[PDB]
């Protein structure tokens, strides 16, 4: 029973987007979980066997408890039965308390087309007679949140990466093959500087919360708060 | 120094509005004071000094640690540099972790000219060369919410009021000139069942919560989460 | 030719987003006719034939011309060329004046992916050229409305149910398997005082309008007033 | 007691609006009141007493029962308690079901500042411990609209004004001196076809409704259907 | 290496949207290229053979260098991994700098329809490991603009066409068959004097520029601009 | 004539929010006038006479032509005749093509409240009729554009400041009162680090468009784009 499950398109999704809160949740003994759909197969750096050995390493640096791989097309995200299905599956397995995914509104379309598959997949993961491939139990996902890998939006809440903003950028830098050029990458937005302009945004998103960073997040479901109104 | 300081624009408005999260902190041994910005004197229903009393009578019932009345004109909260420095001089003296005021969508303009005169005095209040009328030292709120009067909007977030709903009604009760008609009221859209219309919407963001009964609040300011994320 | 055809993925959703309106509609002596695009075979509770039964009672209670089932998946209204061409089939049979869908905005993903094939079925419905399953002929649907199932929203008008309300009610409690816990039933977010939440949304929006009792209605199309502006 | 009170902040304004619905509610045997806020003392073409005469020949030409001409200042719009309270005195004298007035988002500031100061009073007018200029009685305002002016949005509803855009074209052609160049007219975005424009907007939601031309409205107030939902 | 590729679900689309941008650009000496997804089989008036004909006329009205016709089904546009791989062939073959597309806004679900097999495509051909039809090599479009066909909405900016608004209303009249009623024609929203609307709304644009015609446009990507800031 | 006039609350906001593009200007030759509505006294840091000197040297940093000090009161931008007046005669002074002021949404309400001030006297300063303090004759300001202080927002389009970020960096660091803690500082949101999360927000708006730095406008009025589109 895991206390979080992370879900991206591609390894680095969930870095990008969350890498500081995974960091921060691992450090509070919460169990967490990460799910890639695809095997990045189309990334125009490295090969497959390659980035999934980055992965590894990039979730052994945030202490991620298991890394899921699914095999779902690069850039063939489509909405389908079988799609969900798969996706399903994962949910009942890790039977999470908080999924997070891609926020919809970024230039990569896979980022979007996850959401909607992730999304479709909490819901039938909920209903007993939707029946997966290994026919586990209904699982009801408590709380749903939605990160950003490409996009700097103004998000519903942030959270507090300050004491864990240099194991994000350690897990960031196990993707050599996607950030750091080599004699045989080809340029890309991510060979560019991007480490530095992710820094950029959660510095930022610190500022209007008055730490040095956070992350930011958004949520579809009512966000229901408690001990964080006061904060004391 | 209290935890929370609510402004009204009128005696009811901030029962109306979060009298469920008022019993709540209180109960949680938050020192809460309630300011309302006028005395009410253009209400259709009841007189000044009855409806005074009746605002006593309601902060006892959720446990208010102070009602502070301001004496700004009931239809004439204009903005004014006057207004803000009156407002501010109640920010300096109670030195609240958390402002609440009301939310600015909403049939009655004063809710709306109230919130605007309290957002200025709340930046005014945090600026030592701004002079009030006591001539009080700069106070940064932390914290600063909006709460529904006459509105059924999606909030930012909600707050469980399941356990003093009851506390809730009693505070609103104890305006009976406002809610409870006699031989001489006349009609108003507060005499015709207004605290079962209140009830009905807190079960309505109860239900998108997974509780009995909750209240609806915004934020203009980012909020920042960490307990409430996976709430354990 | 129908006044109305009312769209629900599963029987109960047009009962619990317009249930009042169309009682009213057929008081006035119009000819409604309501389609469930699925069996609800993936319902926690009841089976298919007992659904099918509840269904066919609720309508009678509203005095629903027709019933029809389309038997489209439960979870599976994925969009197709296929899907939209058997709902063309129901659009050219009843001709309709006016067509109601769920809102998309809502929990049940169901609802949103029912109304994305309702729109693309309303449009072909309309080209002759494009041919449907029984060849029927071209029909432009006047009047395109959105009612709510699971969501809360501000409404872009509403229609008064006050004197349909208990109708509704009834046409509801029809729905036993789903509503009223039996020796046999699972918890589900329909089997906890759903019904009474229906009623308090229906009296908020009551409430905006100076009714007891409103449903409320989304046009994507433009809404064209007459007699509605002064309403005399 | 009016069916229709239209504000305006300068002669015209009422008649690029909504001149079209005027002439219809009229000829409905409708009494139809106008009021400009202002004497439009600051407009680059014409005279004040100039201006008067050609709004008269506008009213006569839509047929509006009488033109109540107030005195605040042009470009002095400010929100103001005066200015408010001889509003209110306007309402409470016309007792009108309906109050129609500018839409704010126009590039000309005095419309918005006209709303402001309308909808202040529309509540005021209500409020019998209120206290006007004359001590009239408290009115309450049932139908609350907005038209629009310079701008082209998408609006709420629209209402068929196909058989009184050549009256509505007749009540602009008064206003010579804002419309017609003259030997001694300075150039204005007025004087460069600008009722070619307003009959383009008309013609454009004319097409949305699938009629030939219809002014558009917007309202804030929750808008409730009853013959316009299926309009038979 | 084309300046400008103008996708359409229909020819027809990209003349009512940017006919007037189309023929600006072709007297500024651009490569201008054209792309119908469909052959319009299921239009009401005409034939796929007359269709193509106009089409090919329209284009040499407007100066465009090539016309380039794929076959996605008419009400056929379902995102497809199949129909997006045929539009990045025609992306990496004309490898244009600027892309146009159709707003989804419209009540044609195609135009919505098209734009996301469009904008999935962009994408797939900056990849160079995605593979289309004919194997061609990566191609990043840097400007994605979208035109209007059926709305009226507010646009993110305008270009003036008052110079060659006549060529654009001379490359819409080529599309007899669509706009001019024979003895064989039926009754569309095309048939019904759609040119003169479309012209009235580049006339609203225009106004709101200052100038007599402007066309509309929504960019998702950021705007960067230079010359356009101070226009001198 | 200038070609640029734009307008801060206080000295240093129009250099944090476009300092990178009056740079950029000034190296075009377009002549750039900067106003300060007041000279700041309520500012924690430093005082008055001070302020003005390190902002005479931030202006011949940037090249700027003149800098033009009026003497609105600090915290007292309340809407009013006299205040837009003041503000008309530097409009009717300066003659500019365009004007540039704070966005709205920013924690500091002064910045929405001078737009305000300037958008009434923008208006104000194209009206003959309309008399200001030195009775100068009437200017139509061509554009309009809004600069972002403190917020973070997604702007309506960028400029590219690649080869003024050093310049503007230069005139932030002129005001050492405000941004450089001394022995007798207090702690303010600008002592803190803030002119490197100016930085990195220029830095985010930079990836956007693909560019090391940019800075982010909005306009109310309708963009029209010439060479920008294609950018060639
Ligand atoms: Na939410
Ligand atoms: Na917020
Ligand atoms: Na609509
Ligand atoms: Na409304
Ligand atoms: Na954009
Ligand atoms: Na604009
Ligand atoms: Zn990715
Ligand atoms: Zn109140
Ligand atoms: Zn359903
Ligand atoms: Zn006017
Ligand atoms: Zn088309
Ligand atoms: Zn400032």
């Given at each position: ?13 969930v870095?990008?987007?969350?890498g500081?809160?995974?960091?921060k ?7 967490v ?19 999934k050995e ?16 699914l ?13 969900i ?8 397995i890790?039977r999470?308390?908080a999924?997070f995914?891609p926020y ?14 992730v999304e ?5 993961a909920g ?5 997966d491939?290994?026919?586990?139990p ?18 519903d809440?942030?959270?507090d990466?300050?004491?864990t903003?240099?194991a ?5 830098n ?11 990458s ?5 060979t ?6 992710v ?16 992350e930011?997040?958004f ?14």
């Amino acid at each position: 029973n895991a206390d979080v499950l992370a879900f991206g398109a591609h390894s680095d999704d969930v870095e990008i987007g969350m890498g500081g809160t995974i960091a921060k949740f691992v450090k509070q003994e919460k169990k967490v979980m990460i799910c890639d759909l695809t095997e990045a197969e189309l990334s125009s750096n490295g090969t497959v066997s390659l980035r999934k050995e980055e992965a590894a390493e990039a979730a052994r640096i945030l202490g991620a408890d298991k890394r899921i791989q699914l095999t779902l097309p690069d850039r063939g995200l489509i909405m389908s039965d079988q799609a969900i299905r798969s996706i399903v599956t994962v949910i009942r397995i890790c039977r999470p308390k908080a999924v997070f995914m891609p926020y919809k509104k970024d230039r990569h379309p896979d980022h979007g087309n996850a959401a909607a598959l992730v999304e479709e997949a909490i819901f039938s993961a909920g209903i007993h007679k939707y029946k997966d491939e290994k026919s586990l139990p209904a699982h009801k996902v408590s709380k749903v949140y939605y990160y950003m890998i490409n996009g700097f939006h103004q998000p519903d809440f942030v959270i507090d990466i300050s004491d864990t903003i240099e194991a994000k950028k350690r897990s960031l830098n196990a993707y050599k093959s996607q950030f750091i050029p080599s004699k045989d990458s080809v340029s890309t937005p991510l060979t560019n500087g991007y480490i530095e302009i992710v820094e950029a945004r959660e510095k930022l998103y610190g500022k209007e919360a008055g730490v040095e960073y956070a992350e930011g997040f958004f949520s579809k479901r009512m966000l229901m708060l408690d001990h964080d109104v006061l904060g004391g």
